[PDB]
Amino acid sequence: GRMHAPGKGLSQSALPYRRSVPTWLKLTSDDVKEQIYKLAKKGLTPSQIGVILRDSHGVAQVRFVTGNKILRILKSKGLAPDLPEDLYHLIKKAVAVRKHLERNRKDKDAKFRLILIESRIHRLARYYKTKRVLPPNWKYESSTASALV
Amino acid sequence: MQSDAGEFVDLYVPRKCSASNRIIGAKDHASIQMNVAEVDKVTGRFNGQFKTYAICGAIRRMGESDDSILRLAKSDGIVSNNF
Amino acid sequence: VRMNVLADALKSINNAEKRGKRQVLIRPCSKVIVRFLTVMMKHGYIGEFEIIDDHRAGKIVVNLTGRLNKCGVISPRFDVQLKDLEKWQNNLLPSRQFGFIVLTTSAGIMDHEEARRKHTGGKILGFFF
Amino acid sequence: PLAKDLLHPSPEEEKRKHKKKRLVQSPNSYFMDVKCPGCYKITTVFSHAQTVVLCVGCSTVLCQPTGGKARLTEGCSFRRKQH
Amino acid sequence: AKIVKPNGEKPDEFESGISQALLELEMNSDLKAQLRELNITAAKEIEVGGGRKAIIIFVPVPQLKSFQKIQVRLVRELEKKFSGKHVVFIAQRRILPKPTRKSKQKRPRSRTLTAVHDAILEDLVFPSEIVGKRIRVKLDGSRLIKVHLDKAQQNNVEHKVETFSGVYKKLTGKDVNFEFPEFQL
RNA sequence: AGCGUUUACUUUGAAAAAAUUAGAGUGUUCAAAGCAGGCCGCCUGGAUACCGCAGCUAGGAAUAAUGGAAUAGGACCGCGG
């Protein structure tokens, strides 16, 4: 079930058995690597690079076409953004809810949902601290959380 | 059910259901034993032999006694394998 | 969430047996499950089984016979000393004649009979009788 | 049904089952070679695209994103790619 | 010769003959530019059931992809040479022993038994790829693996089933049946 | 004689006061006890087990923790030093 909801949703991807790249695909490891570099440097998250490839170019999964995961390509090349692109999105949402809530003061629901999002920021922030993706000093504080975009 | 000597010592051996492999107790009055006749290959007449099948009470009232008898008959070669 | 995998494997066998199924599907297979089911099979409580192999945790289809009464797990996995096998198998097993306690020793995963045979303790996983 | 062949299900039953609840999970999606009414070059498009796939040089737009499968525009033939 | 062995030892007149049959094929065939830097490691000759044999050739792991590129066109030429004996190409993978307590870096999990045995079974049946595997645990405790191959290249591969089972048995010591299933493609 | 990712687990060995308890021998006339006794000077016992947990020691490596290369400041091999 969902972390902060009563729902029990079963909706995600289902990878096929065969990890082999199909015959029709002519894009080689270096061609998709040049493509990934171009998309990331345009300004685009590992998620959005992945969907662009499979929709338009027809790249089933980059881990089979290449030997790497999109972020390991980008962090090897040194195009990986510092604070991760799920921690980023949680902070971005939390700022968007607080900016709404600073105006609409009697929004008791927005107050409750802000508490849930922030509990999720802390919980993911500490995972990244243990795995040495962040400094041990890294803090989520709503005072100067907007400094992080 | 024999001692160190090898004398069969318990007073009887209860039949086991042909389907589920459960044992058919003394006061199990919803169990069956159905003799299915044997046909002579060329004439199409009754030989005088049959393939007997015992079935448990729980299997019958569950309603799998039909499909169970069917599988046992199909395995014994009574019912055609195409069916 | 799924914290004990052997617990759910043995409960799903137990319900399938009671209900009167000929075979059952075990979802997340593991060495401990396959090593539990080989001990069961070796005495002849289950028939053959076939571990279906996707690129994840596998699946097991076990051919059930109708000669298994109960197969249960013991969580937590207590440290059964050799001098404690008796007082465990006294209250877990139905009789001194049939039934087995599989326990994970240094040698491998095996029943109380072979653990006594090789003069070894270990940790209780479950029982089948 | 007590006896069911769990190992060997017939294609219709496991074509029906939810994509995760099959024996070996497999996607219900695919890739399709799709072409425009004017141009000769073909484009690879995912079944459930979720972007707008522009014909190269933005000559036109091929698909449109929706709930499930991506709606291909009217007057564009397609041939689903297989391996 | 084109047969460089990992140890500085000398090729038995057998596999020298194979690597010198590759000298002949290089210098003649349309495959001349391809068989230039491409090398062979070793070639063993094993006796399968019935009255047949298979020549099993060892390729360096990085060069396998370049060998897979040409294999069917090359297997053809080497099978038309070597009379009535099947030939199959396998990348030679190192298999590091599991680190115990008695006794060095983290053993890379590519160099483990389960991984290389899955790699061997992938590299045997090259053109017709694997779609399914099932390990039938027989009643005695012994296991039998059942590899479901790609149904395309049925008649291209179905004549090498007994050979593949015999070779994989010699390498690893694992019993294999080879099926072509009918309910996917 | 030395060296060899740590830890729990398990089996072995050591070290563990007697008395009590379990327990072998022995007609306190039997028994509770007692450590005596037995044979025509001699012959004999006064055993053995049990004693958690922590500490010590040697085997085993299933199970459950924990560590190694990813800014390569990686292992090995050699040459300037």
From Swiss-Prot, chain A:
UniProt modified residues of type Phosphoserine? S29
Q: Which residues carry this modification: N6-succinyllysine?
A: K26, K33
Which GO molecular-function terms appear in the entry?
A: small ribosomal subunit rRNA binding; structural constituent of ribosome
The annotated crosslink position for Glycyl lysine isopeptide (Lys-Gly) (interchain with G-Cter in ubiquitin) is: K26
User: Keyword Plastid: yes or no?
Assistant: no
Name the SUPFAM superfamilies on file.
S15/NS1 RNA-binding domain
N6-acetyllysine is found on: K26
Q: Mark the residues carrying the PTM Phosphotyrosine.
A: Y37
User: Where in or outside the cell is it found?
Assistant: Cytoplasm; Nucleus, Nucleolus
Q: Where is this cross-link: Glycyl lysine isopeptide (Lys-Gly) (interchain with G-Cter in SUMO2)?
A: K42
User: What UniProt keywords apply to this chain's record, in alphabetical order?
Assistant: Acetylation, Cytoplasm, Isopeptide bond, Nucleus, Phosphoprotein, Ribonucleoprotein, Ribosomal protein, Ubl conjugation
Q: GO:BP terms for this protein?
A: translation
Q: Give the main location.
A: cytoplasm
Query: Any coiled-coil ranges, and where?
Result: none
Q: Which residues cross the membrane?
A: none
GO CC annotation, single: nucleolus
Q: Which InterPro entries match?
A: Ribosomal_uS15, Ribosomal_uS15_arc_euk, Ribosomal_uS15_N, uS15_NS1_RNA-bd_sf
Q: What does this protein do?
A: Component of the small ribosomal subunit. The ribosome is a large ribonucleoprotein complex responsible for the synthesis of proteins in the cell. Part of the small subunit (SSU) processome, first precursor of the small eukaryotic ribosomal subunit. During the assembly of the SSU processome in the nucleolus, many ribosome biogenesis factors, an RNA chaperone and ribosomal proteins associate with the nascent pre-rRNA and work in concert to generate RNA folding, modifications, rearrangements and cleavage as well as targeted degradation of pre-ribosomal RNA by the RNA exosome.
Q: How does the record describe its quaternary structure?
A: Component of the small ribosomal subunit. Part of the small subunit (SSU) processome, composed of more than 70 proteins and the RNA chaperone small nucleolar RNA (snoRNA) U3.
Its protein name is Small ribosomal subunit protein uS15
Q: Which organism is it from?
A: Oryctolagus cuniculus (Rabbit)
UniProtKB/Swiss-Prot annotation, chain C:
Q: Which UniProt keywords apply?
A: Cytoplasm, Nucleus, Ribonucleoprotein, Ribosomal protein
The protein's location, in the record's own words, is: Cytoplasm; Nucleus, Nucleolus
List, alphabetically, the Gene3D superfamilies matched.
Answer: 3.30.1370.30, 3.30.1490.10
* Statement: the UniProt record of this protein carries the keyword Cytoplasm: yes
Q: Which GO terms describe its molecular function?
A: structural constituent of ribosome
List modified residues, type N6-succinyllysine: K87
Q: Name one GO biological process term.
A: translation
Q: Which Gene Ontology cellular component annotation is one that this UniProt entry carries? A: nucleolus
- Annotated HAMAP family: Ribosomal_uS8_A
The record's function comment reads: Component of the small ribosomal subunit. Part of the small subunit (SSU) processome, first precursor of the small eukaryotic ribosomal subunit. During the assembly of the SSU processome in the nucleolus, many ribosome biogenesis factors, an RNA chaperone and ribosomal proteins associate with the nascent pre-rRNA and work in concert to generate RNA folding, modifications, rearrangements and cleavage as well as targeted degradation of pre-ribosomal RNA by the RNA exosome. Required for proper erythropoiesis.
Q: How does it assemble?
A: Component of the 40S ribosomal subunit. Part of the small subunit (SSU) processome, composed of more than 70 proteins and the RNA chaperone small nucleolar RNA (snoRNA) U3.
What name goes with this protein? Small ribosomal subunit protein uS8
Native species of this protein? Oryctolagus cuniculus
Identify the gene encoding this protein: RPS15A
Swiss-Prot record, chain D:
Q: Which cofactor does it need?
A: Zn(2+)
Q: Does the keyword 4Fe-4S apply?
A: no
Which stretches are zinc fingers (C4-type)?
A: 36-58
**Self-association or partners: how does it assemble?**
Component of the small ribosomal subunit. Part of the small subunit (SSU) processome, composed of more than 70 proteins and the RNA chaperone small nucleolar RNA (snoRNA) U3.
Q: What does this chain do?
A: Component of the small ribosomal subunit. The ribosome is a large ribonucleoprotein complex responsible for the synthesis of proteins in the cell. Required for proper rRNA processing and maturation of 18S rRNAs. Part of the small subunit (SSU) processome, first precursor of the small eukaryotic ribosomal subunit.
Cofactor remark from the record: Binds 1 zinc ion per subunit.
| Keyword Ribonucleoprotein set for record | yes
Q: Which residues carry this modification: Phosphoserine?
A: S10
Task: Enumerate the Pfam families for this protein.
Answer: Ribosomal_S27e
Please report which protein family the annotation says this sequence is part of. Belongs to the eukaryotic ribosomal protein eS27 family.
User: What SUPFAM superfamilies does the record point to?
Assistant: Zn-binding ribosomal proteins (SSF57829)
Taxonomic superkingdom: Eukaryota
What name is this protein filed under? Small ribosomal subunit protein eS27
UniProtKB/Swiss-Prot annotation, chain E:
Keywords in alphabetical order, please: Acetylation, Cytoplasm, Cytoskeleton, Isopeptide bond, Nucleus, Ribonucleoprotein, Ribosomal protein, Ubl conjugation
Cross-link (Glycyl lysine isopeptide (Lys-Gly) (interchain with G-Cter in SUMO2)) at residue(s): K65, K69
> How would you describe the post-translational modification of this protein?
Phosphorylated by NEK6. Ubiquitinated. Deubiquitinated by DESI2, leading to its stabilization.
Q: What Pfam families does the record point to?
A: Ribosomal_S7e
For molecular function, the Gene Ontology terms on record are: structural constituent of ribosome
Task: Give the matching PROSITE patterns.
Answer: RIBOSOMAL_S7E
Q: Which GO terms describe its cellular component?
A: 90S preribosome; centrosome; cytosolic ribosome; cytosolic small ribosomal subunit; nucleolus; small-subunit processome
Q: Where in the cell is it found?
A: Cytoplasm, Cytoskeleton, Microtubule organizing center, Centrosome; Cytoplasm; Nucleus, Nucleolus
Task: For this entry, list what GO says about its biological process.
Answer: ribosomal small subunit biogenesis; rRNA processing; translation
Q: Does the keyword Zinc apply?
A: no
Q: Which residues carry this modification: N6-acetyllysine?
A: K69
- State the InterPro entries in the record: Ribosomal_eS7 (IPR000554), Ribosomal_eS7_CS (IPR047861)
- Family from the record: Belongs to the eukaryotic ribosomal protein eS7 family.
Q: Kindly state the subunit structure of this protein.
A: Component of the small ribosomal subunit. Part of the small subunit (SSU) processome, composed of more than 70 proteins and the RNA chaperone small nucleolar RNA (snoRNA) U3. Binds IPO9 with high affinity. Interacts with NEK6. Interacts with DESI2. Interacts with IPO5, IPO7 and KPNB1; these interactions may be involved in RPS7 nuclear import for the assembly of ribosomal subunits.
Tell me which PANTHER family the record gives. Answer: 40S RIBOSOMAL PROTEIN S7, SMALL RIBOSOMAL SUBUNIT PROTEIN ES7
Descriptive protein name: Small ribosomal subunit protein eS7
**Gene label:** RPS7
